[PDB]
Amino acid sequence: LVRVAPSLFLGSARAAGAEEQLARAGVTLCVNVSRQQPGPQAPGVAELRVPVFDDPAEDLLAHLEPTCAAMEAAVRAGGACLVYSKNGRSRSAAVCTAYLMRHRGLSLAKAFQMVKSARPVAEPNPGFWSQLQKYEEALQAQS
Amino acid sequence: ASPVPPPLVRVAPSLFLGSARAAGAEEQLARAGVTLCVNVSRQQPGPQAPGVAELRVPVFDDPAEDLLAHLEPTCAAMEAAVRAGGACLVYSKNGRSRSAAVCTAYLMRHRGLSLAKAFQMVKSARPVAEPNPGFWSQLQKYEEALQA
């Protein structure tokens, strides 16, 4: 695991099965960005599955707002979120960036470089990156 | 033990409660525009419905389980799905305790109902509805927290 920001962690496939660190990190919600992959054995840890493959043609944007709202509520309740995908490089990086934009008032550049600074391999696929820019322009418009 | 029918029930707008059979009624879920399944259990299988986000709230139907700790974060995910124009399915094995408690808390937290009327809506939609005594205690505490 990697702490991206206060109360926000990013991880790869095995992260949800590291039950003892999840309790150490105070993780209370795992966001599992996949269609086929196992939930955390972690007891007492809620898990939200966002069902998309790591492929540019899948619609992640449609899930961003309700997933970020779940994450923020978990943080505001005094817990922390772990966002993870198979590689810990695209899907989970995309959701982490979207979260930082929606609830920590960052731009894509500064949000993604927060993510990249915690997880160097971070690299949302180009379709997700386009959807992240569209997500930002939606956040601009509502302002 | 086969769960009490029907598979799923409308409790209130954009909000359905269900038993084990609910997650296995994929076409009713798509017809109702359910965009979020709330699986209130440790061991029940998620909605075999594809592309629908699923939130597991890991508790047994046991009075010593802390459901209260999950309420605020579960209710906010449900509200976000409702606001985006979809619907939520809250389900537990029997469709009587865990899922009824979460539906009740959701009505209190985001539709401004008291515990009395939130549960009255749940029980009217699902007559067997009965949060176990520990869950009821946690609902009473959640209500007094919401007042303050």
Residue numbers in the entry:
A (entry chain B): 19 to 161
B (entry chain A): 12 to 159
What did the original publication write about this model?
Dual-specificity phosphatases (DUSPs), which are known to remove a phosphate group from both phosphotyrosine and phosphoserine/threonine, constitute a large subfamily of PTPs. DUSP28, also known as VHP, is a member of the subfamily of atypical DUSPs and contains a single catalytic domain, whose precise biological functions and enzymatic characteristics are largely unknown. The DUSP28 monomer adopts a canonical DUSP fold composed of the core region (β1–β5 and α2–α5) and two mid-domain variations: α1' and α1. To the authors' surprise, DUSP28 has an only partially exposed active site pocket and exceptionally low phosphatase activity, which together differentiate this protein from other DUSPs.
An asymmetric unit of the crystal contains two molecules of DUSP28, which are designated as molecules A and B in S1A Fig. Among all the 176 residues of human DUSP28, residues 12−159 of molecule A and residues 19−161 of molecule B are visible in the structure. Collectively, the observed dimeric structure of DUSP28 appears to be a non-physiological crystallographic artifact, and it is presumed that DUSP28 exists as a monomeric form in solution. In our human DUSP28 structure, the predominantly positively charged catalytic site pocket is occupied by a phosphate ion. This anion is stabilized by a number of hydrogen bonds mediated by its oxygen atoms’ interactions with the backbone amides of β5−α3 loop (P-loop) residues including Asn105, Arg107, Ser108, and Arg109, and also by electrostatic interaction with the guanidinium group of Arg109. Therefore, our DUSP28 structure is in the “closed” state (ASC1), like most previously determined DUSP structures, indicating that the composition of the D-loop and P-loop of DUSP28 is well-organized to serve its dephosphorylating activity. Nevertheless, a significant difference between the two structures was observed; the side chains of Asn105 and Arg107 of DUSP28 are bulkier than the corresponding residues Ala410 and Val412 of DUSP10 (top). This situation makes the active pocket of DUSP28 only partially exposed (bottom). One unique structural feature of DUSP28 is the presence of the proline-rich N-terminal extension region (residues 12−18 of DUSP28; A12SPVPPP18) immediately before β1 (left); this unique proline-rich region is absent in homologous DUSP proteins (right). Instead, it appears to play a structural role in sustaining the protein folding through hydrophobic interactions with neighboring residues such as Ala33, Ala34, Pro58, and Leu100 and via a hydrogen bond between its hydroxy group and the main chain carbonyl of Pro56 (top). In agreement with these data, the direction of the backbone amide of C103S in DUSP28 is toward the outside of active site pocket (bottom), and its ϕ and ψ dihedral angles are in the “most favored” region, unlike those of DUSP3, DUSP10, PTP1B, and PTPσ that are in the “unfavorable” region, on the Ramachandran plot.
